[PDB]
Amino acid sequence: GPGSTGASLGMMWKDKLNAMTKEEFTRYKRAGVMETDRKEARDYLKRGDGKTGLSVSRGTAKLAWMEERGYVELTGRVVDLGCGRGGWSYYAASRPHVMDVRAYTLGVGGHEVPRITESYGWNIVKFKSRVDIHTLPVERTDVIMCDVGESSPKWSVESERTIKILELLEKWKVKNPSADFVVKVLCPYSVEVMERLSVMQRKWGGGLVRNPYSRNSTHEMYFTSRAGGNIIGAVTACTERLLGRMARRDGPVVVPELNLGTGTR
Numbered sequence: 001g002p003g004s005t006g007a008s009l010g011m012m013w014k015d016k017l018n019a020m021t022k023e024e025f026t027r028y029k030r031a032g033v034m035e036t037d038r039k040e041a042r043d044y045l046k047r048g049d050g051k052t053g054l055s056v057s058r059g060t061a062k063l064a065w066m067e068e069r070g071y072v073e074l075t076g077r078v079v080d081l082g083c084g085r086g087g088w089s090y091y092a093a094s095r096p097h098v099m100d101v102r103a104y105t106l107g108v109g110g111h112e113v114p115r116i117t118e119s120y121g122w123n124i125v126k127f128k129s130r131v132d133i134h135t136l137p138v139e140r141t142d143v144i145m146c147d148v149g150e151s152s153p154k155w156s157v158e159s160e161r162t163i164k165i166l167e168l169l170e171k172w173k174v175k176n177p178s179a180d181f182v183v184k185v186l187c188p189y190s191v192e193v194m195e196r197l198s199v200m201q202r203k204w205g206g207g208l209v210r211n212p213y214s215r216n217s218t219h220e221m222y223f224t225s226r227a228g229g230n231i232i233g234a235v236t237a238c239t240e241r242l243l244g245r246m247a248r249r250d251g252p253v254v255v256p257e258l259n260l261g262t263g264t265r
């Protein structure tokens, strides 16, 4: 495929997601998706028992899966652009080769607020809320982490939002050319995103990965420093599966939550 084939396929997927009923959507959303079980975690969150190693969100697992399979090498200083509740930050912290973790996010108008918790490594985590990552002055880092991307029914909106994030990586990577990156690509199937993505690969290496834990309702993929392959091929593969799961009626694949344990480093 040239890239336009990839593009119109994702757009087919989008139209088919939007045309669903609430019934079909809620079913499809989770069908065959890996799902961390939050029964216990939700209780600690509702109660506010910050003395827990359990994940503050479902981002932790996503990051775990990325890292255990080796699409990123979390070492040294780890900047977490757009950290919401801190699920990635708290994961990054629990990891041996990781020194300092700067977590940034808004946490402002119904936006996820960093959750304070005694998960293993919290002392080397430093949150800042009321922060706009796009204007946060570039600092030196070993790892650039960015899980940002507000979904939308309009793919061109989704792609627009994805591009600002790709330019955010470039900026942060021009000062830190040798650092690892895991970067959300909310709309990898659009024509603009694909061309920027391959240009960035040409410059920085890395590639696209689809996370099992991502819901079928989002087409999100991750651009990481240690993966590789054809980008168009990777997105198309992803679109192919997401389209096929529309006949999937079964539930999610439920897996236990991550426990990072309680403690300091």
Ligand SMILES: C[S@@+](CC[C@H](N)C(=O)[O-])C[C@H]1O[C@@H](n2cnc3c(N)ncnc32)[C@H](O)[C@@H]1O
Binding pocket: 056, 057, 058, 059, 060, 081, 082, 083, 084, 085, 086, 087, 088, 089, 104, 105, 106, 107, 111, 112, 131, 132, 133, 134, 147, 148, 149
């Ligand atoms: C998907 S969440 C992060 C998930 C996180 N790693 C976790 O596991 O909890 C991304 C967060 O970035 C925030 N965000 C979006 N745009 C931002 C911006 N311009 N500046 C700072 N934060 C932003 C959103 O509020 C959102 O909560």
